[PDB]
Design a protein around this nucleic acid. Structure first.
Lengths: 110, 153
DNA sequence: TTCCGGGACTTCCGGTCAT
DNA sequence: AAGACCGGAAGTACACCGGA
């Protein structure tokens, strides 16, 4: 599993919204709680000492590619520069609408 | 290379060249996102090519990096013809992608009623819930398509 | 064909900038 | 003066390959 797949997993998990969430309808997302996301990443890769420092470095390696890039000026904000609609079938916008709709249903139930 | 030529040929729907490359010994590969020749053939609606790939022994349920299978692509694109042959060669009608969505979910999202009916005939599970707790029925409702909603309830 | 040596982070770190 | 991000250098682990 590659970092981008894990982040996309979290970004589509209504329960993860508090640590990582989309910011806008263009692909940008923010690691609202960078260290927690790092801890979670480390648990998937089985890296007990993973942290935002190491995770951001891995994120920077994506800078040469066509997947993720940083959002200049915004603290902890990155961007999925790939065409998500063709990748998974929904755009960042469509995905964000769906994940928010799900979180609402959850709050309504609880 | 041979593997790439195969990927390109399938995408292009060049079934004879596909036969050709597989004869020469072209390695069944995939791109940076796990997209294989079969995903490409089914996605672009290349019937003869898909069929030739199937009869070549390629993986029916090959998964991309977002867990999509060729059936997912075919259903999503509305290629009932392609969906039918894939099912006819043992494709799992119930495969779920990264968002826990099935070909039924996608054919519904994109309003492909005929693919939805075909899927329903091949024993597709009509009530599976996606990562967003949606069954195909919910998608049809969210899309205001009452005709599909009725066959999906 | 079996067998087998040879192309995505993780960890550490020095440095820019801006507060 | 004294946090967030950058990107090089080196290490690892696992996928894939062209050959004996």
């Amino acid at each position: 599993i590659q970092l981008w797949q894990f982040l996309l997993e979290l970004l589509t998990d209504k329960d993860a919204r508090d640590c990582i969430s989309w910011v806008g309808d263009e692909g940008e997302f923010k690691l609202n709680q960078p260290e927690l996301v790092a801890q979670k990443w480390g648990q998937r890769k089985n890296k007990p000492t993973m942290n935002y420092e190491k995770l951001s470095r891995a994120l920077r390696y994506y800078y040469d590619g066509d997947m993720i890039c940083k959002v200049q000026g915004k603290r902890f904000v990155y961007k999925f520069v790939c065409d998500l609609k063709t990748l998974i079938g929904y755009s960042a916008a469509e995905l964000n609408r769906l994940v928010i709709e799900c979180e609402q249903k959850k709050l309504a139930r609880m | 290379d041979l593997g790439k030529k195969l990927l390109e040929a399938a995408r292009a729907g060049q079934d004879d060249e596909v036969r050709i490359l597989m004869a020469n010994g072209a390695p069944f590969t995939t791109d940076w996102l796990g997209t294989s020749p079969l995903h490409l053939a089914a996605q672009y609606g290349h019937f003869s090519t898909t069929e030739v790939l199937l009869r070549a022994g390629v993986s029916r349920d090959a998964r991309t990096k977002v867990d999509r299978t060729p059936l997912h692509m075919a259903a999503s694109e509305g290629h009932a013809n392609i969906v039918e042959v894939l099912l006819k060669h043992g494709a799992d009608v119930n495969a779920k992608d990264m968002l826990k969505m099935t070909a039924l979910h996608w054919a519904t999202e994109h309003n492909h009623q005929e693919v939805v009916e075909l899927l329903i005939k091949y024993g597709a599970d009509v009530h599976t819930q996606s990562k967003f707790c949606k069954t195909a029925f919910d998608i049809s409702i969210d899309n205001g398509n009452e005709d599909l909603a009725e066959i999906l309830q």
